[PDB]
Design a binder for these strands. Structure first.
Length: 155
RNA sequence: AAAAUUUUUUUUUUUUUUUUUUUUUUUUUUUAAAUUUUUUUUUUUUUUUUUUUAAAAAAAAAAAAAAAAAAAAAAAAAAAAUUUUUAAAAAAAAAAAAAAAAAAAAAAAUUUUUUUUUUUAAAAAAAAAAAAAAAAAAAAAAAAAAAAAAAAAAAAAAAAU
């Protein structure tokens, strides 16, 4: 049934109904206990993070996918959110993303370092530095984070 | 601002694959189909004549069969308001594989239609190969998942203020 669900999700995404596709996938997981393949989750995460869908509240659904996808045993996607944060991501959504991935208030230092590097590589030193205001001291006083903010300076 | 990390193990999902099995598709081998008239030329039979080589051909006559050239008629088509010309109508669209173009989303992830080419109009037996499905696993893992573990602080239970 997983291949059929994958084809159904692709058909709904191709018919401009990604918002309905997320609701259908959530209803099928909660009610009928489907276990979709990783490619379906990849397609849903990639399609929900487009510019028009994300501005209409799609980012909350794409963020809530990660606990649901984590429940089945899948690894959480890190790559597709970087492209969204490099263009129009906000710090309030960034801290929610960095806290919704795991339960111990943050992942390891490498994920936050990758977020800072991705938001620095697109000449955005405002929200990238303001996101450092919302994290505790062990990231703020870490030598690697201060080094990364000292290399890709706005100068 | 204050107070209220170290090692190792793997699980997903990978990255290729190793082997085995099944199915679809394809290739290979053998197998079901059958108009008339005049002139000229060709072939089987009979006898005679001549020539040639170690056994054949050619010349003449007769009998029988077929094809081509010319004429007439029949049939079919086009032009003008009579003339010319000579194996027949075509079940075909869908499906299958590959390539290109178009539009609308991403722009270099995962959809569509159109156009072009090939095939299907194909059945029994035999054999292998590509794709899909199922399984164990042979090697590299970020982050998630844990344990021991530099933790520390608060509470509870048990042994020797």
């Amino acid at each position: 049934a997983d291949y059929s669900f994958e084809k159904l999700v692709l058909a709904y995404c191709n018919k401009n109904q990604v918002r309905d596709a997320y609701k259908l996938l959530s209803a099928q997981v909660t009610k009928n206990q489907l276990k979709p393949r990783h490619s379906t989750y990849k397609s849903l995460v990639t399609n929900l993070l487009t510019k028009k869908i994300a501005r209409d509240g799609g980012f909350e659904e794409a963020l809530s996918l990660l606990p649901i996808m984590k429940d089945h045993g899948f690894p959480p996607f890190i790559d597709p959110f970087m492209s969204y944060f490099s263009s129009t991501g906000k710090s309030t959504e960034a801290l929610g993303f960095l806290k919704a991935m795991t339960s111990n208030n943050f992942p390891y230092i490498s994920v936050v370092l990758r977020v800072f590097e991705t938001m620095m590589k697109s000449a955005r030193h405002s929200e990238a530095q303001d996101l450092l205001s919302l994290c505790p001291n062990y990231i703020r006083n870490n030598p690697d984070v201060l080094e990364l903010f000292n290399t890709m300076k706005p100068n």
